[PDB]
Amino acid sequence: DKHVLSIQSHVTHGYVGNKAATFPLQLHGFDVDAINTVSLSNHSGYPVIKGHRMDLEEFTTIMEGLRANDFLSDYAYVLTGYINNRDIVRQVAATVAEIREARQKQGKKDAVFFCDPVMGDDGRLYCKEEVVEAYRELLTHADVATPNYFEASILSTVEVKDLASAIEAANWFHTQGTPTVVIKSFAMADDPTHLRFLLSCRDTGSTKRYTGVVPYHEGRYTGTGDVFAASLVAFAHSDPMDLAVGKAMGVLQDLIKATIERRELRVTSYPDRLQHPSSVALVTPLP
Amino acid sequence: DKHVLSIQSHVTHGYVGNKAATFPLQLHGFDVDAINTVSLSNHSGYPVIKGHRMDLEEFTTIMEGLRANDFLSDYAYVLTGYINNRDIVRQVAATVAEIREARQKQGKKDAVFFCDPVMGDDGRLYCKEEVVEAYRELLTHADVATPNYFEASILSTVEVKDLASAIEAANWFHTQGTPTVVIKSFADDPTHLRFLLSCRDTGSTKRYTGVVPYHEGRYTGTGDVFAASLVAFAHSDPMDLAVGKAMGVLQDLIKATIERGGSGKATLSSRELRVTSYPDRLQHPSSVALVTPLP
Numbered sequence: 001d002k003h004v005l006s007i008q009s010h011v012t013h014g015y016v017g018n019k020a021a022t023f024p025l026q027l028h029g030f031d032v033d034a035i036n037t038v039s040l041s042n043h044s045g046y047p048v049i050k051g052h053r054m055d056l057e058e059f060t061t062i063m064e065g066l067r068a069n070d071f072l073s074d075y076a077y078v079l080t081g082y083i084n085n086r087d088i089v090r091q092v093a094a095t096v097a098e099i100r101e102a103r104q105k106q107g108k109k110d111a112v113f114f115c116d117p118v119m120g121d122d123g124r125l126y127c128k129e130e131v132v133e134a135y136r137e138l139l140t141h142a143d144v145a146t147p148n149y150f151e152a153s154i155l156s157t158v159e160v161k162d163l164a165s166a167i168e169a170a171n172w173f174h175t176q177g178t179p180t181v182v183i184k185s186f187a188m189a190d191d192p193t194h195l196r197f198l199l200s201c202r203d204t205g206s207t208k209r210y211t212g213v214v215p216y217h218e219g220r221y222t223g224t225g226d227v228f229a230a231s232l233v234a235f236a237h238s239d240p241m242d243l244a245v246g247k248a249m250g251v252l253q254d255l256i257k258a259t260i261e262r263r264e265l266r267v268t269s270y271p272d273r274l275q276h277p278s279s280v281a282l283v284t285p286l287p
Numbered sequence: 288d289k290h291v292l293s294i295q296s297h298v299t300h301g302y303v304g305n306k307a308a309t310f311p312l313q314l315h316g317f318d319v320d321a322i323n324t325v326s327l328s329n330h331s332g333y334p335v336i337k338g339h340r341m342d343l344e345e346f347t348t349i350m351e352g353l354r355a356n357d358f359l360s361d362y363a364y365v366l367t368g369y370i371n372n373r374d375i376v377r378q379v380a381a382t383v384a385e386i387r388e389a390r391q392k393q394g395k396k397d398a399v400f401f402c403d404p405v406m407g408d409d410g411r412l413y414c415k416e417e418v419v420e421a422y423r424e425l426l427t428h429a430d431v432a433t434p435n436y437f438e439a440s441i442l443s444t445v446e447v448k449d450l451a452s453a454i455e456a457a458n459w460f461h462t463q464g465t466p467t468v469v470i471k472s473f474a475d476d477p478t479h480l481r482f483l484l485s486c487r488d489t490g491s492t493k494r495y496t497g498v499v500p501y502h503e504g505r506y507t508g509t510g511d512v513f514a515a516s517l518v519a520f521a522h523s524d525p526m527d528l529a530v531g532k533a534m535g536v537l538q539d540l541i542k543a544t545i546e547r548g549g550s551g552k553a554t555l556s557s558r559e560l561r562v563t564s565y566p567d568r569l570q571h572p573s574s575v576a577l578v579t580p581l582p
């Protein structure tokens with residue numbers, strides 16, 4: 001039951017996408033079955049990016065092999081990240097539905113679909129508007145979504161700038177049909193040394209909300225969301241979602257503080273820290 | 288020092304090529320830069336295999352990204368496995384030469400190129416015939432080669448059936464220009480497999496042999512974890528101890544695969560190597576096979 005289908009980027013150099021997600025999940029005892037939506041030399045922040053991008057036919061070809069060999073019922077978890085292709089984003093919906101059906105037929109626990117709606121960061125979109133709408137549709141089928149504040153803002157049309165606006169953005173995701181939302185971080189004008197996160201859990205129609213903070217470290221980091229979502233899948237397998245978010249945040253804080261001592265996360269260097277973070281973030285219920 | 292360029296297959300399901308090699312190398316503290324020569328649903332052993340295969344242009348496109356960002360001097364190790372493309376196999380010699388020149392321009396020690404000539408197993412080619420000769424041409428530029436006994440047999444044209452025949456096959460590799468050869472396993476005594484390590488400086492050859500328990504059944508990915516383990520141990524062990532430790536890793540891995548229900552009669556899925564099951568045993572195997580000098 002620790003089997004994840006991970007639909008994300010591959011880079012030869014550096015740690016984003018399946019390069020950020022695979023080692024942490026393997027360390028936690030998961031089999032990671034990766035579909036590499038792109039196979040590039042490196043992440044999009046280097047001066048030169050080269051390599052291959054999947055089209056829809058390449059994705060449905062891989063699916064045909066997974067289907068033919070009866071692997072689809074293996075996937076207790078689906079984790080989607082960088083896709084940046086309208087046709088493949090839409091196709092994930094059918095892929096998740098076919099996995100749900102194969103698992104239901106075999107009497108296994110429902111799959112948990114973690115959707116990381118990877119679109120941009122730091123005010124910059126890296127996809128066409130058609131990808132934004134495709135994620136709005138796919139999120140009608142997600143169990144968990146892990147947007148950064150920029151993605152939560154563009155999907156909901158709420159500027160996420162504080163806890164109130166994070167909650168309005170999260171409430172949009174619930175209405176869309178995602179029961180569990182993590183807005184991974186936002187800056188606060190009124191609290192400049194912290195980043196705040198929100199965990200919002202819709203049932204009753206009732207919503208349990210949790211918040212907390214991490215230190216706002218100087219500098220910019222790549223692959224933070226990708227290690228975060230992978231770590232969240234790992235912890236959420238055995239922990240309630242609030243404690244799973246706390247551990248995942250602690251993993252990210254150990255990795256960032258290591259990088260400052262010691263932009264690229266050295267995901268490989270602190271294997272102990274990926275499993276047992278030096279501290280957990282408090283994840284406290286809101287009234 | 289601990290940076291590997293690994294040119295091998297990617298599979299979604301199961302544990303061969305880059306998926307099999309990457310986790311062990313990461314646990315040993317290496318950055319693995321993977322070029323995925325194919326992106327397939329699963330290994331060639333299953334009834335159905337689907338997905339994308341690199342052509343030479345896709346390979347040179349990735350190399351341009353690595354060149355333009357000045358990453359080539361980082362590669363202290365080059366490891367090749369599944370390519371199954373005559374043009375890309377041919378292009379690896381130019382890639383390695385370019386890395387050696389980038390490294391010297393930065394005052395770095397020379398790279399070590401580990402060439403796993405991935406072509407076939409159990410007496411059957413699963414590569415195009417064209418690829419066999421391309422491996423003969425690449426092996427003259429390899430520092431270390433890790434053929435299975437079938438690959439050693441088809442490259443040298445010696446039937447590797449026993450220690451003497453493995454030695455004749457290894458001598459062919461050395462004459463071809465490969466200084467260090469590991470024939471990973473061959474055939475009394477039904478309950479063991481024997482291996483050969485052969486090191487040509489000198490003009491002299493130091494040979495070693497050893498055995499591992501033979502386990503009933505066909506495993507896939509065993510060569511791929513072995514070559515990755517060998518790169519990892521050879522970074523801080525003499526080659527004979529590195530072979531001993533890599534054999535030990537494989538014995539633990541095969542025993543964990545059997546114990547989780549992957550016996551000789553179990554499904555292909557059940558026999559997939561349990562690469563993630565015992566990460567400590569990937570670094571520190573429960574046994575180290577003896578690698579004893581031949582006279």
Ligand SMILES: Nc1ncnc2c1ncn2[C@@H]1O[C@H](COP(=O)(O)OP(=O)(O)O)[C@@H](O)[C@H]1O
Binds near residue numbers: 222
């Ligand atoms: N500058 C920062 N200081 C502290 N923690 C950070 C910082 N940037 C990222 N993080 C951590 O990484 C996690 C994910 O990063 P975030 O920027 O929210 O997502 P993404 O990488 O997708 O944009 C956050 O929840 C937080 O734990």
Ligand SMILES: Nc1ncnc2c1ncn2[C@@H]1O[C@H](COP(=O)(O)OP(=O)(O)O)[C@@H](O)[C@H]1O
Binds near residue numbers: 499503
């Ligand atoms: N059936 C087996 N029993 C025991 N060890 C095995 C078995 N198959 C493979 N191994 C181990 O895996 C290593 C590599 O496997 P081998 O079959 O020689 O290469 P390949 O997987 O490339 O064909 C061997 O050196 C040995 O240690």
Ligand SMILES: Cc1ncc(CO)c(CN)c1O
Binds near residue numbers: 011017042222223226
């Ligand atoms: C290919 C790829 N995947 C994922 C991410 C996000 O962490 C980026 C952006 N660095 C990227 O370029």
Ligand SMILES: Cc1ncc(CO)c(CN)c1O
Binds near residue numbers: 508
């Ligand atoms: C795609 C691929 N890579 C590597 C290997 C070697 O173990 C095989 C054959 N199982 C294969 O099919």
Ligand SMILES: [Ca+2]
Binds near residue numbers: 121122148224
């Ligand atoms: Ca961010």
Ligand SMILES: [Ca+2]
Binds near residue numbers: 121220221222223224
């Ligand atoms: Ca960032």
Ligand SMILES: [Ca+2]
Binds near residue numbers: 118148225226
């Ligand atoms: Ca992200």
Ligand SMILES: [Ca+2]
Binds near residue numbers: 408409435
């Ligand atoms: Ca074999």
Ligand SMILES: [Ca+2]
Binds near residue numbers: 420423424
């Ligand atoms: Ca020739």
Ligand SMILES: [Ca+2]
Binds near residue numbers: 426428429463464465
């Ligand atoms: Ca030579």
Ligand SMILES: [Ca+2]
Binds near residue numbers: 507508
């Ligand atoms: Ca085999």
Ligand SMILES: [Ca+2]
Binds near residue numbers: 408511
């Ligand atoms: Ca092999």
Ligand SMILES: [Cl-]
Binds near residue numbers: 161163164196
């Ligand atoms: Cl706030």
